[PDB]
Amino acid sequence: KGFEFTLMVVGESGLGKSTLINSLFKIERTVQIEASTVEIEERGVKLRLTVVDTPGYGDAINCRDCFKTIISYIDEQFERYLHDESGNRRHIIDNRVHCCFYFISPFGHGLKPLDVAFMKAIHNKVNIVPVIAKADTLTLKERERLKKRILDEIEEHSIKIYHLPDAEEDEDFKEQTRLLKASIPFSVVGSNQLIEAKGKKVRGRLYPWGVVEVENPEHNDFLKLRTMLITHMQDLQEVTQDLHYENFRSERLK
Numbered sequence: 001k002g003f004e005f006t007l008m009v010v011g012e013s014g015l016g017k018s019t020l021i022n023s024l025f026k027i028e029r030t031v032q033i034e035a036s037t038v039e040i041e042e043r044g045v046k047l048r049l050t051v052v053d054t055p056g057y058g059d060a061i062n063c064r065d066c067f068k069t070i071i072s073y074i075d076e077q078f079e080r081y082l083h084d085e086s087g088n089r090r091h092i093i094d095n096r097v098h099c100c101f102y103f104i105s106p107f108g109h110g111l112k113p114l115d116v117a118f119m120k121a122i123h124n125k126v127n128i129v130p131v132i133a134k135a136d137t138l139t140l141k142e143r144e145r146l147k148k149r150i151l152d153e154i155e156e157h158s159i160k161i162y163h164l165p166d167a168e169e170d171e172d173f174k175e176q177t178r179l180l181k182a183s184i185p186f187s188v189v190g191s192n193q194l195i196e197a198k199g200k201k202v203r204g205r206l207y208p209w210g211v212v213e214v215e216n217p218e219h220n221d222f223l224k225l226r227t228m229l230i231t232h233m234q235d236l237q238e239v240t241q242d243l244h245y246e247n248f249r250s251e252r253l254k
């Protein structure tokens with residue numbers, strides 16, 4: 001009994017993409033597409049979590065090149081899945097990208113022109129979850145001003161984004177659902193380093209005026225992103241099967 005899920009991370013270079021995924025479950029600049037895998041096996045359950053790191057655009061890599069290589073990768077995993085399906089292989093190993101975190105610079109008006117290009121290049125091929133990178137550069141009012149616009153410009157530009165399901169019908173879930181739905185785009189902070197924050201070493205951003213904690217819900221939206229991801233793996237998977245994969249199958253079998 002096997003379950004496989006693949007997460008991709010995408011966006012402008014230097015937005016802390018590699019740092020955040022290393023932090024999810026000397027850390028150099030990402031030059032090519034790099035996949036890392038976490039295989040959990042016990043009893044008769046075999047979980048496979050793949051994380052696809054991508055080189056960001058704008059520093060040594062021009063945006064058109066960057067999303068061409070990313071699109072190429074996504075279409076390849078569709079290709080592979082189709083081939084395994086094209087003969088019967090009723091039990092396949094699934095490499096499709098079921099979720100893509102789009103990292104947005106905190107320094108922008110909302111989505112910069114190149115971001116809109118990128119997102120629209122891939123929004124029909126993958127579930128996009130937009131995140132505000134390096135949120136420790138942002139005041140709470142600044143976070144909120146940015147969050148609104150990103151959402152506004154996503155609508156303005158007809159950018160297709162993964163939306164959460166809700167209500168199967170329950171109470172504790174009713175809150176967590178509306179909360180997570182409201183806190184999008186998540187403003188996140190990542191850290192590769194641990195700092196003595198009184199009695200236990202927590203990650204992890206040491207400034208002379210204070211310390212930023214990755215896993216403090218009041219500092220940033222990391223745990224919210226992480227729990228959103230865990231608890232919605234199944235929906236994200238079905239949608240890429242029913243909507244994104246079908247549109248691939250649409251064109252290639254034609």
Ligand SMILES: Nc1nc2c(ncn2[C@@H]2O[C@H](COP(=O)(O)OP(=O)(O)NP(=O)(O)O)[C@@H](O)[C@H]2O)c(=O)[nH]1
Pocket residue numbers: 012013014015016017018019020027028029030031054055056057133134135136137188189190191
């Ligand atoms: N302010 C701030 N800086 C961060 C944060 N996370 C990482 N950084 C810094 O940003 C640097 C670049 O991080 P990195 O994860 O490599 O970014 P990237 O998006 O993967 N870069 P690339 O796309 O070029 O490979 C890190 O070396 C770290 O010093 C964060 O949450 N906040």
Ligand SMILES: [Mg+2]
Pocket residue numbers: 017018019028029030053054055056
């Ligand atoms: Mg990187």
